[PDB]
Amino acid sequence: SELLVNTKSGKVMGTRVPVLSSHISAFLGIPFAEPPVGNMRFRRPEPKKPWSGVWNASTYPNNCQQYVDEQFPGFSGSEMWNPNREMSEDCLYLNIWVPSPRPKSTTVMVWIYGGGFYSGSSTLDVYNGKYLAYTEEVVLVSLSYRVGAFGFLALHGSQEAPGNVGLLDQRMALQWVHDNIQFFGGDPKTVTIFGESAGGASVGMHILSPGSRDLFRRAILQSGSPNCPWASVSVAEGRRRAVELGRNLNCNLNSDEELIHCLREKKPQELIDVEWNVLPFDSIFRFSFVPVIDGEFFPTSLESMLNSGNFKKTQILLGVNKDEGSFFLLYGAPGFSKDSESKISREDFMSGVKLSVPHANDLGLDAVTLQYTDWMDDNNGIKNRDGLDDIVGDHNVICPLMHFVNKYTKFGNGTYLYFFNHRASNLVWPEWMGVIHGYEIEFVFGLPLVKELNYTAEEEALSRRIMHYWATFAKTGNPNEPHSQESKWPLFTTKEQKFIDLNTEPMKVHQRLRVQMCVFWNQFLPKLLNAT
Numbered sequence: 001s002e003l004l005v006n007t008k009s010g011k012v013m014g015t016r017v018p019v020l021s022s023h024i025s026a027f028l029g030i031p032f033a034e035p036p037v038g039n040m041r042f043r044r045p046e047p048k049k050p051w052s053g054v055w056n057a058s059t060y061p062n063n064c065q066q067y068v069d070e071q072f073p074g075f076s077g078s079e080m081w082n083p084n085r086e087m088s089e090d091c092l093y094l095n096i097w098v099p100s101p102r103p104k105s106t107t108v109m110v111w112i113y114g115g116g117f118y119s120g121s122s123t124l125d126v127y128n129g130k131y132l133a134y135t136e137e138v139v140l141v142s143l144s145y146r147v148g149a150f151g152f153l154a155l156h157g158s159q160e161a162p163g164n165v166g167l168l169d170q171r172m173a174l175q176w177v178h179d180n181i182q183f184f185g186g187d188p189k190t191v192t193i194f195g196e197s198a199g200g201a202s203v204g205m206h207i208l209s210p211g212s213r214d215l216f217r218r219a220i221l222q223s224g225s226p227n228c229p230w231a232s233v234s235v236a237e238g239r240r241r242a243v244e245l246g247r248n249l250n251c252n253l254n255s256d257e258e259l260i261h262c263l264r265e266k267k268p269q270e271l272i273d274v275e276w277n278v279l280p281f282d283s284i285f286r287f288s289f290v291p292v293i294d295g296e297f298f299p300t301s302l303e304s305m306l307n308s309g310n311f312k313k314t315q316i317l318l319g320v321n322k323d324e325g326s327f328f329l330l331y332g333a334p335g336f337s338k339d340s341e342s343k344i345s346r347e348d349f350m351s352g353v354k355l356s357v358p359h360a361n362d363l364g365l366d367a368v369t370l371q372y373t374d375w376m377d378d379n380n381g382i383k384n385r386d387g388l389d390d391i392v393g394d395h396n397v398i399c400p401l402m403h404f405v406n407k408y409t410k411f412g413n414g415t416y417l418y419f420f421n422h423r424a425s426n427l428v429w430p431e432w433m434g435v436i437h438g439y440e441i442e443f444v445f446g447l448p449l450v451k452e453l454n455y456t457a458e459e460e461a462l463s464r465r466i467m468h469y470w471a472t473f474a475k476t477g478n479p480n481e482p483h484s485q486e487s488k489w490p491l492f493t494t495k496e497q498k499f500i501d502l503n504t505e506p507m508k509v510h511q512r513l514r515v516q517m518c519v520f521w522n523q524f525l526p527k528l529l530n531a532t
């Protein structure tokens with residue numbers, strides 16, 4: 001039986017699914033860890049105890065407990081990111097799409113979802129790996145991990161809530177793939193992990209963490225990097241937020257043991273209800289429970305690891321979208337709304353800058369303001385809006401990524417950088433939002449190949465082009481087809497710093513992505529805030 005696979009953890013039975021007038025095998029809901037429930041909440045994951053009998057892997061598993069976006073009820077633009085399955089703390093499962101007939105030893109790609117470490121599901125329609133598994137002949141795996149306080153509550157020193165357990169969930173899933181993917185026809189020595197935003201940051205964190213390095217061959221980071229102002233906190237800040245969470249739930253705060261005991265007795269939704277009250281500043285693009293620089297998963301500060309080359313040396317493919325910050329301004333910045341063009345007044349622009357750079361003093365804010373303001377026309381609502389959009393994307397995604405790429409390439413074995421600037425023709429979000437954060441994903445997963453989804457013929461060509469770059473990179477460490485007549489995606493080098501745009505137009509090569517603004521964010525502003 002092509003749908004029956006015997007693994008080291010036990011037997012599993014998948015289901016046959018249709019895809020682009022053909023079919024492939026799908027094994028959904030495979031458990032890789034013991035349910036992290038009860039006294040196991042906030043604790044490191046435990047491997048799933050082997051089972052006798054056949055595990056039914058015909059349907060999607062539950063999604064981890066998380067905040068649910070209800071800012072636009074019934075709107076597909078936002079609900080397509082929400083959990084589409086019931087939520088439960090019993091959520092540590094992985095899904096696998098296997099070509100048919102089953103391969104013997106083919107390239108494997110493991111997807112790590114984003115969601116600011118506070119949300120995300122492996123079951124979203126936009127993450128369906130059948131199109132990619134079928135089109136590129138790869139074994140596509142999508143894992144899951146605890147988010148919110150459930151996966152990142154951090155009380156360093158404690159052994160009940162050490163922090164980073166969400167990252168350990170990811171690692172345990174990677175370990176499972178390492179040990180069992182061969183049974184599904186995948187090559188465990190040719191595993192590429194890829195993810196977007198928080199998932200991209202996660203990928204970078206596995207590149208850094210010694211305990212994850214041996215579990216994969218190469219990586220792809222989309223709109224995310226480990227060094228991002230929002231992807232991690234110090235052990236002290238992690239502790240402060242954990243304590244504050246307890247304070248919000250009337251917990252005994254006399255000891256970690258007591259705090260944890262109290263937090264474990266609360267219902268999931270109780271923690272989620274007050275999750276956002278623990279942020280230290282009024283801000284956007286900042287999440288409460290994220291990875292912590294603890295000295296375990298991360299030996300030293302991320303910057304010192306990057307400077308000394310203390311990370312896995314392999315090939316990486318990464319990039320960003322043109323308008324990473326628009327989503328976050330819509331949800332929290334004054335003056336922005338979904339049904340208007342969101343032309344911003346000078347006043348709202350000022351408020352936006354403050355929300356975007358919470359760690360900056362007045363001089364720092366003046367610096368950012370000066371850098372992104374057209375003083376010949378500073379009341380221009382469109383320029384104010386776009387300027388704010390750039391500030392958010394540059395500070396939170398692009399410049400941190402450019403810093404990572406510059407540091408990684410010094411020791412790496414091959415870097416490929418892209419700039420995705422094509423807005424989907426069928427995007428339901430307003431036009432002012434541009435090439436939105438996360439909207440390159442549908443292209444990576446081949447949704448444009450599905451007629452009923454209504455993408456242009458050109459967009460279908462882009463998706464196929466992108467999927468082939470990704471899969472070819474996963475397979476060989478180079479996105480370019482050897483001896484092909486296609487345009488070549490040049491390697492990114494310290495010297496030339498080349499990258500390509502990813503859109504429906506003929507591929508063009510550029511250099512020094514966002515270098516002017518990133519020198520400001522990566523070199524100048526930090527010096528300024530330090531000197532003042």
Ligand SMILES: *[C@@H]1O[C@H](CO)[C@@H](O)[C@H](O)[C@H]1NC(C)=O
Pocket residue numbers: 412413414
């Ligand atoms: C990658 O490493 C191999 C040796 O393992 C070397 O031959 C090759 O030139 C390297 N490629 C780059 C661009 O670093």
Ligand SMILES: *[C@H]1O[C@H](CO)[C@@H](O)[C@H](O)[C@H]1NC(C)=O
Pocket residue numbers: 056057058059
């Ligand atoms: C999984 O397979 C079983 C066969 O044992 C089938 O009866 C069941 O419908 C499947 N799971 C679902 C959809 O509940």
Ligand SMILES: CC(=O)SCC[N+](C)(C)C
Pocket residue numbers: 081113114115116120196197198327328436437438439
């Ligand atoms: C800005 C948006 O449309 S939300 C996307 C959520 N994701 C980055 C984790 C996929």
Ligand SMILES: CC(=O)SCC[N+](C)(C)C
Pocket residue numbers: 069276327328331
């Ligand atoms: C992009 C987002 O959903 S953050 C908004 C959540 N908040 C209302 C609790 C701050």
Ligand SMILES: [Cl-]
Pocket residue numbers: 007008
């Ligand atoms: Cl076995």
Ligand SMILES: [Cl-]
Pocket residue numbers: 018019020021450
């Ligand atoms: Cl289909």
Ligand SMILES: [Cl-]
Pocket residue numbers: 162163164165294296297
């Ligand atoms: Cl830890």
Ligand SMILES: [Cl-]
Pocket residue numbers: 228229230232233
């Ligand atoms: Cl930080």
Ligand SMILES: [Cl-]
Pocket residue numbers: 243253254255256259
């Ligand atoms: Cl405490």
Ligand SMILES: [Cl-]
Pocket residue numbers: 267268269270
């Ligand atoms: Cl609940």
Ligand SMILES: [Cl-]
Pocket residue numbers: 244277278279280
């Ligand atoms: Cl607080």
Ligand SMILES: [Cl-]
Pocket residue numbers: 229356357358359360
């Ligand atoms: Cl900041």
Ligand SMILES: [Cl-]
Pocket residue numbers: 366367370
């Ligand atoms: Cl000034």
Ligand SMILES: [Cl-]
Pocket residue numbers: 402403404406522
């Ligand atoms: Cl830099």
Ligand SMILES: [Cl-]
Pocket residue numbers: 077426427428429
């Ligand atoms: Cl859409």
